[PDB]
Amino acid sequence: KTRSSRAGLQFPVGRVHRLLRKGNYAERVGAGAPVYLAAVLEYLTAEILELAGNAARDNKKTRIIPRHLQLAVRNDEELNKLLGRVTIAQGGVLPNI
Amino acid sequence: YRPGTVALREIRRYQKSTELLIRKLPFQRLVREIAQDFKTDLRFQSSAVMALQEASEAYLVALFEDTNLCAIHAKRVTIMPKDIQLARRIRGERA
Amino acid sequence: TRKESYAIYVYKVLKQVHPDTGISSKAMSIMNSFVNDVFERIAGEASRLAHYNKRSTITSREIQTAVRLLLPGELAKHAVSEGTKAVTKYTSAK
């Protein structure tokens, strides 16, 4: 019955639409804009948590922690390019190996 | 242990962990002093000091990486002040 | 302050990809910052895209090109495919 479930999204399309209004990014916001944006946010969240979940399994840990997010991001060329100017709190460095 | 290996052993140890490496209270005192020069009787939310330490240490670590590349470029292993001055000048921080 | 967070939705997405694993509260706050940052960067680019064209409205066209500007390489191709799929299934529903 939610707008999210008509798109098939987990992320809140209504929340995104409200934020697009609150931020006064433009005079108008189209009906498709928040669905598209929520879908893109969901995709990027899933891809991050996928790689952090792999990194958590490889380290034999049950919880994903900032170390695993840092490993996942920095090992991927594209996520590392998206987050190149970003510092992750309690992240280490990549070891030289 | 082979002679002189311990430096590389330290390199392994500190790269593997995620700890903050500066003592917390000294860095807090430094932040307090610098802020006090801008504006007297400021207060700091403790997470503000933690965020400022995390950004500071991440900045210093990346600067030492660039400095070590400058040292290697000079066919040299000891990092020298002029390596830091080169890294900072190339990365645009001579300001 | 009833602070807005994505945590319950990050959890729901997490349980689609790694249902066996959990997520630390700190890593959750990092994911929350990540989602906010990517949202603000896409909305900002879509804003100046609209202004450059002298249009008053932000549509799926603006979000799509803001994604193609902001995201590198194949990450863009898949994000755009996901967005157009979601907009299609929404438009073919109530």
């Binding site: 995709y43 899933a46 891809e47 996928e50 792999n54 990194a55 490889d58 380290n59 170390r67 695993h68 490993l71 996942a72 090992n75 991927d76 070891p95 | 242990y1 082979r2 290996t5 590389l8 052993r9 392994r12 593997k16 | 997405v13 349980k15 689609q16 990809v17 249902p19 194949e74 990450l75 898949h78």
Partner: peptide
């Protein structure tokens, strides 16, 4: 395993565990 990403990623090993037997 309900959701997967089609990205043509290379494989990666994330294990940080290490030893010093080559320093010994």
């Amino acid at each position: 395993p309900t959701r997967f990403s089609n990205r043509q990623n290379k494989t990666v090993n994330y294990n940080i565990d290490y030893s010093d037997d080559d320093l010994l």
